[PDB]
Design a protein around this ligand. Structure first.
Ligand SMILES: NC(=O)c1ccc[n+]([C@@H]2O[C@H](COP(=O)([O-])OP(=O)(O)OC[C@H]3O[C@@H](n4cnc5c(N)ncnc54)[C@H](O)[C@@H]3O)[C@@H](O)[C@H]2O)c1
Ligand SMILES: NC(=O)c1ccc[n+]([C@@H]2O[C@H](COP(=O)([O-])OP(=O)(O)OC[C@H]3O[C@@H](n4cnc5c(N)ncnc54)[C@H](O)[C@@H]3O)[C@@H](O)[C@H]2O)c1
Lengths: 334, 334
């Protein structure tokens, strides 16, 4: 019995370094989600300090099974220390994805997780923007210049050739400076603007993507242009009023969002939100059960907690491409 | 950044093939358990058929962190298909353990899981028997001749040189036959008896270990000799009356046992059991907070759901031994 090991370099070589593989994988997984052909138990958070602990110091286990023609199971096991970049010069998040053959349940692949996690999260923004952003939008905003922001930006630019300007803000000015400098050279024909505050960045974006590590909301509803689509990838950035005031609120998975201690659950627990109030789950937009944007004045909020089936589908596509190209290291289980 | 990969062969070479490493690792982990120096979120079960599914068709995620001098985090991700041995000639269970450095949360080891899982489960029986079995017990019973039974038997014989006879039963006669034949040659001075039914095996054991895959209890209280210690490793074998009638009931972890849909929770939900009724958690016996066996007429039941800290502590000890011996395959994460 063997397993394929794919490090981040191997993942890049097998196509994991381009958005399209993730967009393809997620369109499939989200269709399976809409058709309920998956299983996704709740994610446990392992924290060393469940009391007295930074919200981004954790390891999350994210198991899932996707059914269908090419059923697959697996887990993403993804750790985080808020401190890693500033104190250790290391990426915040790290970890592994294990894929399992659903016939036998045996593990068949062990793969590095963080590039795939970041790219599938960027693909979530792409697919949602296809349904929820103004068609042909020109102005993109990125808040937070870490690995998630970098990939969000890369993928949007790969997937939307009409983007003209990119407003970028980070609380840490130097991170923003270097981020825009790097990108300005990567893409000379797009105009990147390092902004002075978040309000300037948010106010000027037709699509706004949050990519920070914060536990306190700063994005106000009146910052948002009519017609804006906000992909709230880092979840906590957005004031509650935005959930209430947006014309349409979309999540990836309601049961995961309407979960004890979370923003949506809190509005629900008060009498300020419900499932009736929710516009769609993302998969329902992909499959066409529910329409997306219907006019260009609508302000639309996506609040995606992240779903294990996204990681597992992404990793499975990449595993397959790697096997096709004989990329990776064959390990024996026994 | 690197991780050590240890396949089952590497684990054996690093000492993982002898009970003592597991006994040492678990004595440590169970002391940390008694002192509450750990974190162990509830295990999710991923099942393809949560409705219409065999109870042993699943993959379980088992994360934990152990504190102390050599704090460690990790996860056991362990799959099962009941069908694997009979239909595919494959071991029922399989999987991987990932170890994580708690300073950065980065993964540092990827290890095969099933030998370690089976051995740490055998160590649970050893440690409990040290506290709960009649001193110098001569007659051991094993029900179920798969990998768990094999390791339970190996470890008991390694750890208790006074065992004279071993009664063995399996529902599948041929499995029992070959099991005792193999062992009789491995240990010519011990007497192995293949029994005709479970009652004969259970009735004749001073320590009884359950190692089957069943969802229906068959072990009756009146089968048990006064003085017996039952290590109910496969959980479902034991009739409810035994929980009620045993002089002392011990679990590994109450919060895990007193969990919705489980035997103990059910007796609790009725008014037939409580935490007051429970004799000890295993760690409390190890640390001496609560006495073990106090006389030789007591009938004692251990009901251990299995704890992630056992796997993680075991894997960590083995990882360390392997590094000391330069065993295993160095992988690059990136
Ligand atoms: N929704 C999802 O499925 C999903 C998936 C993966 C990651 N995430 C989230 O993405 C976020 C970004 O992760 P990352 O790995 O890039 O982190 P990172 O540490 O690499 O970068 C975070 C960046 O945000 C900046 N920042 C922090 N607080 C800020 C604030 N209040 N305003 C402006 N800038 C701020 C930091 O200076 C840093 O440059 C994390 O919160 C992570 O949990 C969400
Ligand atoms: N408590 C714990 O922490 C823990 C840890 C690991 C495994 N387990 C449990 O150990 C059990 C044994 O696992 P395994 O990997 O050896 O399985 P396996 O399939 O290798 O073997 C099970 C054996 O039991 C026999 N059997 C099945 N039903 C029986 C019955 N009703 N009476 C008598 N014999 C019967 C089978 O013929 C087979 O030989 C599993 O139920 C597993 O969930 C418990």
């Amino acid at each position: 019995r063997e397993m394929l090991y794919l490090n981040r370099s191997d993942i890049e070589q097998a196509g994991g370094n381009h958005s399209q593989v993730y967009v393809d994988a997620l369109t499939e997984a989200l269709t399976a989600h809409a058709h309920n052909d998956f299983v996704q138990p709740l994610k446990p958070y392992l924290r060393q300090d469940p009391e007295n602990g930074h919200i981004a110091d954790r390891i999350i286990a994210m198991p899932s099974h996707i059914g269908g023609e090419h059923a697959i199971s697996g887990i993403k096991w993804i750790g985080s220390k808020h401190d890693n970049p500033s104190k250790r010069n290391m990426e915040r998040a790290s970890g592994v994805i294990i894929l399992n053959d659903p016939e036998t349940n045996y593990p068949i692949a062990v793969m590095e997780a963080s590039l795939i996690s970041s790219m599938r999260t960027a693909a979530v923004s792409v697919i949602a923007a296809k349904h929820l952003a103004k068609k042909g939008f020109k102005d993109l905003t990125i808040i937070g210049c870490g690995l998630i922001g970098d990939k969000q930006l890369q993928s949007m630019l790969e997937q939307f050739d009409h983007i003209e300007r990119v407003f970028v803000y980070d609380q840490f000015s130097e991170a923003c400076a270097r981020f825009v400098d790097r990108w300005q050279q990567q893409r000379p024909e797009i105009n990147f603007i390092a902004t002075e505050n978040a309000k300037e960045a948010v106010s000027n974006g037709e699509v706004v993507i949050t990519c920070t590590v914060t536990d306190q909301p700063y994005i106000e509803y009146d910052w948002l242009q009519k017609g804006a689509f906000i992909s709230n990838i880092s979840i906590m950035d957005v004031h509650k009023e935005v959930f209430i005031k947006a014309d349409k609120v979309v999540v990836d998975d309601w049961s995961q969002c309407n979960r004890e201690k979370k923003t949506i659950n809190q509005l629900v627990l008060e009498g300020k939100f419900s499932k009736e109030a929710l516009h769609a789950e993302l998969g329902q937009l992909v499959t066409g059960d529910i329409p997306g944007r219907e006019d260009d004045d609508e302000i639309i909020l996506l609040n995606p907690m992240g779903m294990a089936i996204e990681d597992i589908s992404s990793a499975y596509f990449i595993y397959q491409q790697a096997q096709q190209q004989n990329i990776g290291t064959t390990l024996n289980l026994y």
